[PDB]
Structure formats: C-alpha cells, structure tokens
Amino acid sequence: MISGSVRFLVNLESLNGVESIGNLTKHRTAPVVLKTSTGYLVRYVPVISGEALAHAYQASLVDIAKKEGLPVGSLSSQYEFIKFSTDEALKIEGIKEPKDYNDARRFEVEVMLKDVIADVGGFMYAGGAPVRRTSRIKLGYMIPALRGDEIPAQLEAQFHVRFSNKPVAIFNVEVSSALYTFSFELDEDLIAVPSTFGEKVKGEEELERQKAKRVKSAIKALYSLLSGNFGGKRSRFLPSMKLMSLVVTKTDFPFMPEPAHDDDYIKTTIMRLGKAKGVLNGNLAKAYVINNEGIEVGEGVTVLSTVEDLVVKLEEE
Amino acid sequence: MISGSVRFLVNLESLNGVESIGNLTKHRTAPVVLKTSTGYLVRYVPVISGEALAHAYQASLVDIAKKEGLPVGSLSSQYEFIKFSTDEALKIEGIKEPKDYNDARRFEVEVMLKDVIADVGGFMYAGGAPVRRTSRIKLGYMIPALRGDEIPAQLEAQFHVRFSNKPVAIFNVEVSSALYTFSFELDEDLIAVPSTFGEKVKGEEELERQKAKRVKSAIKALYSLLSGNFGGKRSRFLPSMKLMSLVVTKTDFPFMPEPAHDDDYIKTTIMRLGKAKGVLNGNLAKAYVINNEGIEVGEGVTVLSTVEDLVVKLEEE
Amino acid sequence: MISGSVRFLVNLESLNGVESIGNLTKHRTAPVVLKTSTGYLVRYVPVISGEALAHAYQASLVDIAKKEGLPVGSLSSQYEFIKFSTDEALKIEGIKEPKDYNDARRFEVEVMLKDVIADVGGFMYAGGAPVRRTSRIKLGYMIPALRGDEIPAQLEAQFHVRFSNKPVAIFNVEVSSALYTFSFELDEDLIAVPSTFGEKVKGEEELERQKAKRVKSAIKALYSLLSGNFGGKRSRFLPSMKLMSLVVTKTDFPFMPEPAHDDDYIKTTIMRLGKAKGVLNGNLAKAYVINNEGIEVGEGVTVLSTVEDLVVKLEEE
DNA sequence: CGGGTTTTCCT
C-alpha cells in the first residue's frame, strides 16, 4: 500500500460548483466541528469534493494508458466514465451480459481485459447477476486545516458584466481562499487481480503479463493529483497553487497517516509507523517526506525536493 | 475483562447508510434525550450502528488468524459472517447437525475447532436442539457527546452529477460532522472455553493448546477498531479522524467505565475502580489513559502516547 | 503547450472596477491567505480579474486576424464577444441551429469556419442539443506577490471636482499600487481541430489548410498581454508598467510553472521541467527566461532581452 | 439548456 497526506495553499479559487440562485454561482460549503479553548463549535466552510479529484486522476490514467499501449475502452476513450453500468454501454462496447452467478468471473475478466479504468477504478453492473468491483484508489473531501481557533479560509462574491452595444448582462461568482488538506490511499497489490470468487478462466495469463505495466501506469497517474491538475472553471479562474507539506508511506500492512490538521503530524505518523510495523508483524515500511515550511520532522527520514523524485522512487521500488 | 471508553472527532463523513428516498442517500439518525438548564429535551442526531464495527473487528480477526496459522472456516474465509446458522452452511463446511441435547457439546466443540470467528464472536443454531454461544466482544451505537446545551454535530446534503456527452445523472448524498463517543468490552478469560454444559469430549486438549494464541489474536484485532478502519463509502468519502481521549481498564471483576459524555469522566472512573476493587474483593485492577485534549486526569495513572503502546501492554500482561 | 509566469510592477493604477457606493468608485478587492513567521493570516488586497485580460487578448486577436485575412464573425467584428450563445446571434450571423446530437459536428464546423475567435476562445450553445468547446487559452486573477510578511501593495482614495460657473460636481476615485504576478497557459496543438466526437464532415480540409495561419496568429496575439495593453480607465489614469521577470516553457506534455510568489522560482521550475520530461516520457522541453532584477537563474538557460524576441522565437519553433 | 437513481436481497 501507498498512503499519503498532502497540504496545499490556494488563493482566489473556484474549482467546485453547486446549484445557482439568481445570477449568483455558489461555491460548495460544508459544516465542520472544531475545538477551541472554549469548547467545541460548528462552522460552515468552503470545501472541494473528492469526485472531481477522481475524475482528474482517471483522465490522466486514460492518457498514460493510451500513450503506453494498454487497452482502453471505447466509451472511456472519450472522457465519460459511465464504465459498464447500463446495458447501453455493454451494447456499445460489445460484451455479453452475465448469465448466472457461475458466469460472473468470465464477465469480470472480459471487462477487465478491455479497459484499464474498469480494472483500477472499480465498477458496478446491475441486473439479474449484478457484478461489483471496489476501487483501488481512495480519496476524500478537501478541507482547510482545522488548526488553532481561527479557520484560515475566506469566501466572497464578485461582480462581472458582459459588454453589449445595445443594452436591453450581470452575474456574480463566488471566490474562495484557503489552506487545503487531503489524504489518499492506493493498494497496488490488488491491481490486475480478479475479485469475484470462482474457478480459473482462460485469459488470466494476459492479465499476469500486463500486471507490471498496469501497476507502473497506476503509480504514474498520481503525478496529476500531486501536481494540481484538477477542478473546473480553469479557463478564466486559474488558481495559484503551492505545495507545503507531504508525507508518503509504503507498507505491507494496513496503515493510515495522521491528517494534516496539526502542525506536528509528520513526527507522530513516523513513530506510529515504526510501532505498527513492530506490532503487526510486517516486513516493509518506508517513509518519504517533503517539507517547505520548516516544521519539525524527526530523525532517520529521507527528505526529497520535488514530486517527480517521489514518483520515480515509488516506481523503482 | 477489558473495558474501554473512546472519544473520536470526525469531519465530512458518511460511514453508515439506510434506505434511500428518490435520488437521496440518507445517513442513520436516532433520537436522544438530553438535559439542559431548562429541563429535558428530545433531539434527532446522526449515529453509527454497532454492527458495522462488529463486522470490521471480525474481518481483521480473520486476516490475523489466517496470517498466524489458526484455523478459519470455509464460508468465513470469504468475508461473509453467516457462521453456522442455516443448514446450507453446515452442508458446505461438512458438519453433522446435533442429534439430541446430550450431543450439543460435541457439536459446539466441532464448530469451535474449525473457525476462530465462531469461537470469539459467538453463534446460534436453531433446530431440534438449539445451540447458543454469546459473543465475547460487546459493542454499542456510536453517539456524539451530549455535553452542555448544544450538541456538537451537524448533517447536510450535497449535490453531485455524472457527466455525459449525450444527455437523455444527478444524485444527492448526506454528509455529517460530529464528535463521536463509544465504549466496548472484551472478556478474554472465556476465550477457547466451551459454554454448553455436559461431559468432557475428546478434542478439548487442542483447544487448551491453542488458547494462548487465540487470546493473543483477539487482543490484537482491537487495533483496527481503535485505529479507524470501519464504515463504508471510503473510496470517495474517506473521513478525517483524530483520537482525543481513551480510557482502558483491565480487571478480574465486572466493571463498566463512565460514558464519554462529560468532560470529567477519567477521574470519576478511576475513583470508582478503586472503590469497586475494594468492595468486590478483587485481586487485579489496572487503568491506562491516553489524553490529547488536556482535560483533568488525576494522580498515579499510567499515561501512554499512541494506541500501539496500549496494544503491546495489553498483550504482555 | 506554452505555459508562462510573469511579474509586473504597477504604480497609481485603477484598471478594474466594481459597484460604486455614493460618489466613490471602488477597486476590486479579494481575500488572500498568507504565511508569516507567526503562522497564517487572512488579508484583503486589491486584485484585477482575468476576464478583462481575456477581452484584451481576444480584441488583439480580432485585429490581427482581420489584418491577415482570416475569417471573422459579423458580431465579433465589433468588439462584442457574445459569440454564438443566444438565438439572436445565430439569426444575425445566419447559421441554422443543430437538429440532433448527430448534427452537432456539422454545426461546430460551420461556426468554426466563420470566426477564429469561437475556435480559439471556445463557445457554448444551449438548447435541445447543447454544444461545447472549452477555451484554448487559460488565464487567472492578477494578484500581488505573497512574499515575506508584508504585502507589497497599497490602496487609497483620491478627491476630484468638476468646475462650474454656476454651482447648484465632486467625486472620489480609488487608486492602487502593487507588484503584480500572473500565469497563463495556451495549448496550440488543439487549435483548428474539432472537439465534438463524430464522423468526418465536409469542410475540415479548409480547417487543415488554415491551421498554420490560425496557430501563428494565436501565438502572435500574446504580445498584447505580455506588453501591458489591458484594463480600463486608461484615458486619464494611464498606469506605469515595467516588466521584471518572465518564464516561458514549451513542452509536449502537461506542465505548470511555479507561481511568481517566491524570489527563487526560475531554478525550481527548470529542475522540475527536466525531471518531468524524464519521468513522463516526453520528447520536447524548452525554456526561456527574461530577467531584469538580478535574481538567481541557473545554468544552461537561454536568456533574452525583450518580449518581441520571445514572440519571434515561439513563432519560429 | 440539457439531464434527476439505478439490483439484490424483506427474518
């Protein structure tokens, strides 16, 4: 598994939208529970959903897969991740629906040999014999850091006009500025492995041949998420992003680093990693840290400089 | 016995679901009675059921048991905890049904020598001669703390879309933020001990040999629950969790610590533990405390740092 | 792709306006989150939106296109970029609305062969069969650099009167001064290429013939943005602009240069460019730097003197 | 302006 926590600083941003009222376009907001010296309070803060990040990741994965020669589905070749949900998609791609429970494994292998996206990002088919496949990359909402007593975020509305020589043309757009945080998880030990229980079916040899390439592509795809190629309204509201802190852990057992809420979340996660490897009888535990804000790190930890170095190191091992 | 009270802080969460209405996925809610300065009131608040936690605990126990060589049932090798309820499971596993009341102990031992899950988590078989085994781990609903006059919890709905080039695609998801509390109990003095009354039956020597490993594995399995690996919808709604306060008590007599609703529940439970050991003629009483919010603790109390240290200490003693 | 970061110094400026209160004309202001040695703070600073920059760029593109003989739409011939959104524009230009999804490609090609502005800057038609084309040039707000603990910006108000021989004439104007920074992106590989998926439609041969001229004009149009020809109230409040630092990158793969916030943002982006070309299996990566403040640059970097040289170099390659 | 929840279980 590869687990990570990342902290970003974003200014003058509008990357996720919600239903509009009047001539105003609104930014997504959510309630958060925060702890101050006086107790616990409830606040409303701008957020960014995780499905936009999932879409960006899967689009980059499609690009890399088509570049490197891996198979890509017909519908997903165009950036429409309906996958194989409805029967219309099955008809377009040309895959017979499963007949019974015993036939499920064949259908899963057939779908899994045509589109890498269905293999990595999971899918669901509903019918007489529904077939499920959980995603191999897990994301979450992007929240500003709940540090201290004051939330380091702000939201406002802005005024815009459309010029016309014959007036008979005014709209408002919400803009936010915050210090976002988020964490991610990716289990590369289950890529290119069937999930439905059953007997062996012809075609798994090709999967075993392509396993290494699929894992390499899946690990490569994370560069988009770690770089900042996500969100909408990028044509006229291009944001100003800057990485601040990053922790990545590679292990052989389940593990979850601390959220990027406290100023000291790198020392704690490394100590916890050592103790967890000791207690769970693991055999591999490595840590990589990127720091640009000069906070406490610890001892005996590899320190990197950019994200390309981290991607290369993750690929090599 | 091992009895514990734990306090968590969760933000932007959807971990337990219930039946859906329209295009809206709903979060579990329950009524709670709360005391304010003006009297008593009834409120509707999001909660998380205990059966999700039980499933997470049993899945982790399956993983550890397979890793350490302890026997695991065939159906329970797959993460499907029907245990030995119906006749189909008995036919699959290959165990003869009990004949009379006198044969109940043999059936319990045979079931108990094949699946550790049936041993630790209890089971039921209904028929001509019913057989019961109560669970050795007990859990409860996860509730936000009912401190003060305002409940520190909030629930809202969010708007999501599925993109398509040929419109002919909209759903809503309920998201919560709360300060959750829950308590648990695990009696390790009865693990690998038959429950049905009767005579001695061949095969108990193997259970006596495996008792130590079974107890060790059961104690290890709590790390998943104390870490935060439970609940659904984790692929796109990965939650942000953080521990705040934990009290764990090891005794030789029945005891129940205070619920984590009042800010002073560590001092009270320690005083009660001392007096209860005095009054019930016990011979062992230990307490461990993890504090990360700076609330009153007391004197002469072991203070830990993480949960791995607690797990190691519980294993060693 | 062509991606750039630019730094400017502006004194006594008022280029973007918002709703006015009383006899005071206000300058656009926005919140920004800044990092200092004491933590993170929220501040209110004057800004300039990106839509004014888009209008300036599109006006210059119209001028160049009409000068070089490329087709220009009737409505956009006058500097009114409603494009083909409403039905009145369609009636004026004389293009039939699309009938079904299968006819979308024909409509896109018909619109795309008449006005280069719709081709480069994209457009949208709403109706029974909506048609979309994302802009090929992406801009953002113009924020002052968030360097150090003190923001290098200031805003004040100024007093003015109107003379009259028969009093019965007083107003206030907001004026700012800052060190602005902004970044831009332009992917020239998709200019003069249809975006809607479908079958071949007559008229694409002319598009392929005109592609070279369209790309050349689009590259030429960046001179207005890089020179300082944008914003309003230039008749009486002509600002004093001076270029300070510029980085331009030409690649075959997605890339985003570092924002012009830190004093050392040229070496970092070149190192990242090299590593990214190594990791993403690219085949082209070139950089150009203009420096007039004597900051660190690096080694093996082409150095220019003016912006016209950069424009010529970008055109030639 | 188009689009507004899909199955498989109900002791």
Side-chain angles (χ1 to χ4, degrees), chain A residues 11-12 67 147 152 156 158-160 163 165 177 220 229 234-238 240-241 293 308-309, chain C residues 28-29 31 33 40 51 54 79-80 135 137-139 141 143 146 256 259 261 272 275 279-281:
Chain A
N11 299 317
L12 266 60
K67 180 165 171 174
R147 184 178 28 82
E156 199 180 0
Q158 306 282 2
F159 190 78
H160 294 293
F163 176 56
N165 308 266
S177 284
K220 248 180 201 188
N229 299 285
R234 293 174 72 85
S235 65
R236 305 280 172 264
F237 298 96
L238 195 81
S240 175
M241 285 204 179
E293 45 182 356
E308 299 86 352
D309 317 310
Chain C
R28 183 159 275 157
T29 48
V33 171
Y40 294 89
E51 283 183 347
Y79 302 94
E80 175 190 328
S135 167
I137 172 170
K138 299 186 181 184
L139 294 174
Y141 272 60
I143 310 149
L146 311 182
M256 284 190 302
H261 287 351
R272 265 175 73 243
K275 275 136 178 196
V279 69
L280 272 156
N281 281 317

Side-chain angles (χ1 to χ4, degrees), chain B residues 103-124:
Chain B
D103 196 70
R105 184 134 187 169
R106 194 270 312 154
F107 176 81
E108 165 157 19
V109 176
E110 208 166 19
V111 171
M112 184 177 177
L113 267 167
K114 194 178 280 188
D115 198 18
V116 187
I117 308 308
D119 176 23
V120 169
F123 73 95
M124 177 208 90

Side-chain angles (χ1 to χ4, degrees), chain B residues 165-178:
Chain B
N165 311 267
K166 295 207 181 195
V168 164
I170 292 162
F171 58 111
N172 280 311
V173 164
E174 276 193 21
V175 167
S176 175
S177 284

Side-chain angles (χ1 to χ4, degrees), chain B residues 2-28:
Chain B
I2 300 171
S3 293
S5 302
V6 184
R7 178 182 274 184
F8 270 122
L9 179 74
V10 192
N11 290 311
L12 263 55
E13 169 269 327
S14 179
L15 292 171
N16 205 183
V18 65
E19 267 181 351
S20 310
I21 307 175
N23 58 352
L24 176 65
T25 63
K26 302 198 80 174
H27 198 295
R28 182 153 276 160

